[PDB]
Design brief:
The protein has 172 residues and is mainly β. It has one domain: Photosystem II, cytochrome c-550 precursor (Porin), CATH 2.40.160. The chain is 0% helix and 60% strand. The protein has strands at residues 12-13, 20-36, 39-42, 44-45, 53-62, 68-71, 79-84, 90-95, 101-103, 110-111, 116-123, 126-138, 143-154, 157-171. It is elongated, with a radius of gyration of 16 Å. Bound molecules: calcium ion (CA). Calcium ion (CA) binds at residues 113-114, 133-135. It is a peripheral membrane protein. Its main location: membrane. Keywords: Manganese, Membrane, Photosynthesis, Photosystem II, Signal, Thylakoid. Belongs to the PsbO family.
């Protein structure tokens, strides 16, 4: 995924008289864990091609409490990934956030390094939860970066996916 400029700094103010969108959200997994004996255990990524989900986008709606809700409306729908257990079993997964609806804390006056988005997604047989932890904001450009954690049930397994993300926020 893209990265922020090395001098990126500040907060990204949110004008309550305007409406906003996520123009691009890219999720780059760094870890796939699969439940075995009740424990999420690490697996090795086998897929050599890109595993990132990119181009995710949609409105950021305002709720009655000043929180923002991101509604995914377009983007790459899924990425097929294969991971390998320690003992050699290869497991195909579809990494996705299709139909994501995710909200921030109340009283959004600016996107900062303490902003979080939490929500759920669901597509076909997968039901999932994800948290986006913003870690860096470029207030000039609307670019943000952070880490994410998702949990879902893809292909008969319970899977946790974690990684880094990049996003760009802008007025409608
Ligand atoms: Ca944070």
């Amino acid at each position: 995924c893209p990265t922020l400029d090395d001098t990126a700094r500040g907060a990204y103010p949110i004008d309550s008289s305007q409406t906003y969108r996520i123009a691009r959200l890219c999720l780059q997994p760094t870890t796939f864990l699969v439940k075995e004996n009740g424990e999420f255990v690490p697996t090795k990524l086998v897929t050599r091609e890109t595993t990132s989900l990119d181009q995710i986008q949609g409105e950021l709606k305002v709720n009655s409490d000043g929180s923002l809700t991101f509604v995914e409306e377009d983007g790459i729908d899924f990425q097929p990934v294969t991971v390998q257990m320690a003992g050699g079993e290869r497991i195909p997964l579809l990494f996705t956030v299709k139909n994501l609806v995710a909200s921030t804390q109340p009283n959004v006056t600016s996107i900062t390094t303490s902003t979080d988005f939490k929500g759920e997604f669901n597509v076909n047989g997968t039901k999932g939860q994800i948290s986006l932890n913003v870690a860096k904001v470029d207030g000039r450009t609307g670019e943000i970066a952070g880490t994410f954690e998702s949990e879902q049930l893809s292909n008969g397994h319970e899977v946790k996916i974690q990684g880094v993300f990049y996003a760009s926020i802008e007025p409608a």
